[PDB]
Design a protein around this nucleic acid. Structure first.
Ligand SMILES: Nc1ncnc2c1ncn2[C@@H]1O[C@H](COP(=O)(O)OP(=O)(O)OP(=O)(O)O)[C@@H](O)[C@H]1O
Ligand SMILES: Nc1ncnc2c1ncn2[C@@H]1O[C@H](COP(=O)(O)OP(=O)(O)OP(=O)(O)O)[C@@H](O)[C@H]1O
Ligand SMILES: Nc1ncnc2c1ncn2[C@@H]1O[C@H](COP(=O)(O)OP(=O)(O)OP(=O)(O)O)[C@@H](O)[C@H]1O
Ligand SMILES: Nc1ncnc2c1ncn2[C@@H]1O[C@H](COP(=O)(O)OP(=O)(O)OP(=O)(O)O)[C@@H](O)[C@H]1O
Ligand SMILES: Nc1ncnc2c1ncn2[C@@H]1O[C@H](COP(=O)(O)OP(=O)(O)OP(=O)(O)O)[C@@H](O)[C@H]1O
Lengths: 362, 362, 362, 362, 362
DNA sequence: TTTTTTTT
């Protein structure tokens, strides 16, 4: 008898795996009998225990194969090929709904019975976020629309404020929400060529704490970033395709993604200021700090950074109508679950705690 | 029974697919029964639903194959070979005649039964562009002739003007129309080597916002742009072939394509000034801004950036005799459709609104 | 008759052999008769003598294969695949538990009957380390807990004090205990990128001997390192993911490991001071120096450098419940062995000798 | 039945086709019935219509093969091998008379029954070019002989002098005649080293407008060009064989071809100036401009760039005995055809119109 | 029946072909009927006509092979392997022995039955050479044996004296008979590192004219060469191995080869002087300039810096016993020719013509 | 083996 390459390709597809080693190592685990498989029995990893029993017989024959890496290479190509197809054919709206469907699926586990997460802790995080800026949930919705529409020369938001004002915290959550990559452009102009390479097929990008010059007036360290960015104004404008590069790999040509720039309080060339559609001023606030000092499970579990938290905020605040049609059914079910588990008074009590700088809980 | 490599190759010719992963991805979709293929039923992508029923039988056998990437590679080579043959044997006029047929096919879809494009919005865009400069349609015809004739050392048009003058917007539409590439020359002088290698077999090129000097007086921060271009006089002149470069590939020798450069008003060594056969100067004009500020669907659908819009302009403004004979038939049908779909009064109403800076529609 | 690739892969898994050439060389040795094998008879290397008799038959056929390196590559891939699976799935507590099992296996050999080590000399090592700082064993337990929880901000420890005050000694033993890498941030800012690349997939990092500035007032040579660290805030706080680079490789994105910073008595910015959960002062003490003179078998055998010594310290001092439940069984057996071989009076006599600055043994 | 790789390789030889993609594309055209082939019917391309009938049967079987690129790779190597064998064995005269036969074969077609351009125009181009400098034919005959004899140090000719002197125009015609290569050195030495590899197996080379120094007083930017020139003096002198480079392929050592190098009026190291038997510059004669401006089919059809124009000029001006012996049959035959279609008075009419600076074809 | 790979390998060995393309090309020529092979009839190339008849049948089958380049790659490996064996095994004397035998075969070419350069035009070269300076044949023989023995310290001679003195001209000529290279030290030490590192595996070496700093007081330009070489004690002495280095390459270890230093009349430290066996100074000579001016055929066929002209000078002056013991056969066989064809009077006439500075071939 | 890294 012979290996079914088809079943391996299915497993790669269903796990959305695209590392040949991870795929290989995972598939090899199935060669022992699932009936005693302690990973199955302890229900430790779904990407194992869902599949072991299905794939078992083929895994045993695969364990004898002399071609093992070639089989995995073909499977990984298929997963990569599907991403390529999607990049050229989905609407930006559909991409976002797909991404949301995956987060919602992860939320299904986290707050499941096997779910380790305390939904009350995660809901506490939403209170702290809704304090960080005026009209926070409206700001998120405006950003999401901006990213979907991707209007040329109206594509980039500037975050600036003192050190320790939560700008990278907020960027992290948006980036996990949408998917994308961070970039560092405080660099020499040569390595920069490969640095920009990682934007390929990404949805967002974030430029992390770019450095101005002469900021030592405000005691800011000076550096490359701003002067270096002004050369790349084309990539911001997104008005035409550009050519992007990776190590040992020939170029690809695409429009450079929309995104966010984070910055200390340097000044900026208005040639670049003109390219930011919007600017948000962050500020340190004492009650956030004193609340947070008394609420450190927020930090310990990274709740405040995580896109799951922003999604929960939108589900709480926004009308069902604002979500694209197919996910509205899941959105309604989560809304019901949230309202069942939390009164408004409980949420308002939490917000009042944050304002009072006590620990969020009481 | 065995895979027809011939049928795969034929699909790649039919679709003009260049990427082995994109080819692989799309051919796999045909493995499921077209009898119920939701993509077919929803009529979403022409390159799928036209072909699924035909290729289904072969795709089922391809889905089992162990060679898959090899079969796709040969198919992609066949498409690339056809481009090489065409590049060496067509007149530039035939190349453009082919390009127009492809756009016209896309227009037949866009405004066809599936009809996703509103021809009213698209024609409103034509009025906006025809307003952007005097005698706009005449200027387009001049540029096309210049690119077709490709007279040596009379090959390049310079666009100069301040920010938001619209020069990029015009250049973007022209690039789509002819199918060129955009290139960045403000980079360091080394990886220009792999950068300019993108121009292999291209019809047209545009260099974007070439960073010069002297403009620091006016807050144009300077760079290698003008330095690098004056280093490349022969590439502009197209007087003799040059070598071009790609990773893991030996050099290709050919004449460098004609085209366009965009400039905020840095200084220019007159060794470059000699080589631009023409320069056009652009100016911001507030009433256009007030127009877009209401008619924002122009930007959101990117209408004013598209070669599709320029093609519609030419069909409106030019004699049928200016077009190559083989398409004059298709041109006549589109002229007829346009006269049916719009009265001159409607177009005059639009163009009046554009001049008023009110929203184009009323 | 055929080679069993399976038996090779099993050997590679059991030896955890990462390198193809090392794997190849060792397997070939088995082709001679284990029954006469001098290396077996002299019990020189466990990775040989445990295995020779089992693999002999397959090694004989392997010796005639024409595919030899191909067999080894597939085997080595299996070992690498296992590591990446583990990296993405194990808890940090699981990782540490595995690491301890490895050390315990080496100790079983070292102090075995074949064992060349002397448990008494190695216990003399523990007495010296326990004198290096107050409450040494509690300090280790605290450090380990901090690494396992990896709580944001609460992640990094500072070792401070003069030259030859022992800080590097303790760093090295901890680094051996946990596994990890040393890094040197005194470099000029451009080279740091590949330097930090070393951190990829590590459990710990140690920053060696970061040079401040202006400590030359105290004869300390000045350097960049302190400023470089103050510019790496997110790497230390560990709240969000970071991109990391290696030579000829594409970047990977992960949370930067926790770790240790070591320095002489440079002044430290408050911005940097706030990064550290804890600071430990090392001071030179003469009685340790005079003891080391008279007890230099400690240095010669590198006892005081080794994680093996720290593990013995944990076994002697900590309650059994403090260890991960699985290994508690082995821990009891080692505690029992140590209790048998040393009365507390013997151990305390050694501690007294170190306090005298006299030789440890009497 | 199976593909004849032999018949494929014959086509590659007889086309002298030298690119694997071009060859692949070309041969696949033959898979259709030649009996109805539109290209055959058009007599569109000789390299098709001469061969379609002969290769049809083999091309049909080739069209089904799975090895298609491998077949073409072997065929291409046969053509490269033939070139390398000629490269060493032939005398420089024997090479040149082969080159002339190829050009004569084109002219037989160009002015043939297909006749796609008319010798009156090309002869007018001869008149324009003979007008460009005194006794043009004689100066050409010197250059040809100098390149055949290839005397060291007395080996290269300079074209210094202003923009739009036509110096590049003359270089292009000579290079087309000789079948050399252009090369660039205005470059980093660490890619210059590999770029020169194109010099393998070339009769002649040309270096274009190389960046000197001192010319910055005349706005000519100084640069790497002349540094790289005055370095490699061996290559200029042709003093000894030296190595040359290719990707994924063996290097080669051989003497460097003789050549021309061109500049505008930079300064030049006398250490370099030593190495040039002729050291000439070129300056505008404005009436020719006014003629060309009124004779633009000359420039549009690139006639005054072509090598064909030089060969026509030599056929007119030179004695039959000045040519290599074997071709003198064809030389006489073409000398007839000129005289059969032109009086001297017609040629002199053209030349006075040119000298007068007026549209030629009265 | 099938291609003998063996026969191909014999031909490669017999012709000492290093290049897979040459081997392929030439071997394919044998496929045509030997019995009327017109290249054989013309006796153009021994590498063909000596072999075709033997290889014919195999070459026919070779031309039908589908595998051709693979056969040639193995054959080329055989020749390279042969070289690398001998390169490691043999003595410097054996190496020079074979190098003589090669260039004696080059004489058998130069004056074979085609006589394609006149043996006595070459004798006129020998005259100009021996007329150059005192006793030149002995000075050659001494320097040659000095370089063969490579005795420590006794390894470097100093060619002082002004420009155009011939010191460059002569030393370069010896390298034809030896291999080797010349190198630069007029440079700051960061260059000098790589510059020294060039010299790997050279049989002999030379230095560029030392522009001695500390010698500018003689009204001369300088580079750092004096302090450089005076510090480079070991490399000159050749008493021990040293390490050598190149861009992007690791170090290599060898005894630094022996050689020649050249300069104008610069200053020298007594220590740097102690590095040399001989001080020489050259000068331009009024007879010799006017002789070459009147004798330029010696330059035209590259005689005056050929090695063959030195070989003939040796075969003239030096007795048979002074040559490699078996090669002495050939020495007699050329003494036969030279002493037959040339009277001492024509030799003395030629020498006297150089002594009068007049044209040698009176 | 190119490439990326080195080199700069
Ligand atoms: N608005 C705020 N007021 C007070 N403390 C804040 C505020 N925002 C963040 N913090 C505290 O500062 C810590 C760091 O937050 P964060 O990393 O997002 O700051 P940042 O200023 O955006 O950083 P960076 O400029 O380095 O990207 C938080 O974990 C929290 O403890
Ligand atoms: N002539 C114009 N008058 C007013 N607004 C204009 C004009 N042209 C363009 N715009 C506005 O400016 C935006 C950007 O135009 P565009 O990028 O083409 O200008 P540009 O001069 O090429 O700019 P840049 O040098 O920044 O790339 C357009 O999307 C439109 O909103
Ligand atoms: N507390 C101590 N008192 C006296 N001597 C010490 C002490 N600790 C270490 N030593 C001596 O110092 C030597 C070096 O130890 P170690 O490298 O750990 O010192 P360090 O302070 O970390 O130095 P550095 O910062 O230079 O690496 C040890 O081998 C030992 O001889
Ligand atoms: N006698 C002339 N009078 C006027 N223009 C001339 C004359 N000869 C040549 N030119 C012009 O020179 C233009 C460019 O020619 P060419 O590129 O060969 O010159 P060049 O000196 O090599 O220039 P560059 O230094 O810019 O490369 C031609 O298009 C031609 O019109
Ligand atoms: N002694 C001589 N007298 C006259 N002409 C000579 C003499 N030697 C060589 N020549 C001619 O002069 C040319 C230059 O000689 P060469 O470069 O060898 O001299 P050099 O002294 O090494 O010069 P430099 O120190 O300037 O590099 C030779 O190639 C030859 O044509």
């Amino acid at each position: 008898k012979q290996v079914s390459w088809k079943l391996v390709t299915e497993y790669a597809m269903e796990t959305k795996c695209d590392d040949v080693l991870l795929l290989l190592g995972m598939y090899l685990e199935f060669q022992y009998s699932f009936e005693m498989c302690l990973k199955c029995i302890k229900k430790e990893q779904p990407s194992h225990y869902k599949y072991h029993e299905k794939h078992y017989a083929n895994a045993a024959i695969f364990a004898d194969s002399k071609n093992q890496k070639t089989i995995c290479q073909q499977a990984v190509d298929t997963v990569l090929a599907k991403k390529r197809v999607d990049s050229l054919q989905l609407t930006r709206e559909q991409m976002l709904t797909n991404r949301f469907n995956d987060l919602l699926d992860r939320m299904d586990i986290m707050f499941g019975s096997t779910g380790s997460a305390d939904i009350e802790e995660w809901m506490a995080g939403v209170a702290w976020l809704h304090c960080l800026l005026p009209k926070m949930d409206s700001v998120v919705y405006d950003f999401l629309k901006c990213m979907v529409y991707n209007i040329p020369k109206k594509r980039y938001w500037l975050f600036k404020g003192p050190i320790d004002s939560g700008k990278t915290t907020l960027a992290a959550a948006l980036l996990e929400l949408c998917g994308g990559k961070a970039l560092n452009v405080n660099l020499p102009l040569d390595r920069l060529n490969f640095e920009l390479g990682v934007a390929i097929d990404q949805f967002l990008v974030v430029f992390e704490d770019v450095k101005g010059t002469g900021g030592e007036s405000r005691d800011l360290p000076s550096g490359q970033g701003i002067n270096n960015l002004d050369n790349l104004r084309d990539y911001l404008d997104g008005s035409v395709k550009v050519n992007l590069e990776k190590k040992h790999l020939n170029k690809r040509t695409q429009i450079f993604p929309p995104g966010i720039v984070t910055m200390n309080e340097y000044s900026v060339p208005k040639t670049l200021q003109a390219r930011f559609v919007k600017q948000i001023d962050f500020r340190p606030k004492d009650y956030l700090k004193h609340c947070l000092e008394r609420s450190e499970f927020l930090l310990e579990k990274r709740i405040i950074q995580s896109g799951i938290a922003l999604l929960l905020m939108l589900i709480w605040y926004r009308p069902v109508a604002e979500f694209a049609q197919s996910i509205q059914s899941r959105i309604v079910e989560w809304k019901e679950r949230l309202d069942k588990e939390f009164s408004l008074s409980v949420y308002q009590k939490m917000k009042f705690n944050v304002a009072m700088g006590i620990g969020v809980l009481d």
